[PDB]
Amino acid sequence: EFNVVPYYSWFSGITQFQKGKEFEFVEGQGVPIAPGVPATEAKGYWYRHNRRSFKTADGQLLPRWYFYYLGTGPHAKDQYGTDIDGVYWVASNQADVNTPADIVDRDPSSDEAIPTRFPPGTVLPQGYYIEGS
Incomplete structure (x- = not known):
């Protein structure tokens, strides 16, 4: 959950x-599939959401990453490939990363989140679970 939208x-x-x-992800992989979006727009970054759980008297919330097309999201102004903590850049070999992706953000109650999937051959990071799978 987010307390800041x-x-x-x-x-x-x-x-x-x-x-x-x-x-x-292996270079050239890692961009989730959005039906109808050209491969040239497959460029962006995964952004880490650190989660913190509240102390109980029992015994754990590990981070969750979310994808943003290049030029959008919390790091909309950063340069592709720049070493930034919590940002993992990814792009298809068809993408030109000097230009932002031609994609508008999601919402309102206009669109639900697309379950993340990757093309056949994509090497998935061990230790991570793809939500909606």
């Missing part, structure tokens, strides 16, 4: 479930 991702999140596992 977040920028909404077009896709479901990827949740870390095993600590110590790195969130990564």
Whole structure:
């Protein structure tokens, strides 16, 4: 949950479930599939949402990453590929990362989040669960 309204991702999140596992994708992979969007627009970044749980007297919330097309979201102004903590840049080999993706953000009650899926051959990061799968 967010107590400051977040920028909404077009896709479901990827949740870390095993600590110590790195969130990564092979270069050229990692952009979720949106029906009808050209491969040239497949460029953006996954943004880490650190979650914190409240102390109980029992015993854990691991981060959840959300995808934003290049030029949108919390790091809309950053340069593709720049080393920034909590930002993992990804792009199809058809994408030109000097230009923002031609994509408008999601919402209102106008669109639900697209369940995150990747093309056949995509190497999935071990230790992460794709929400909606």
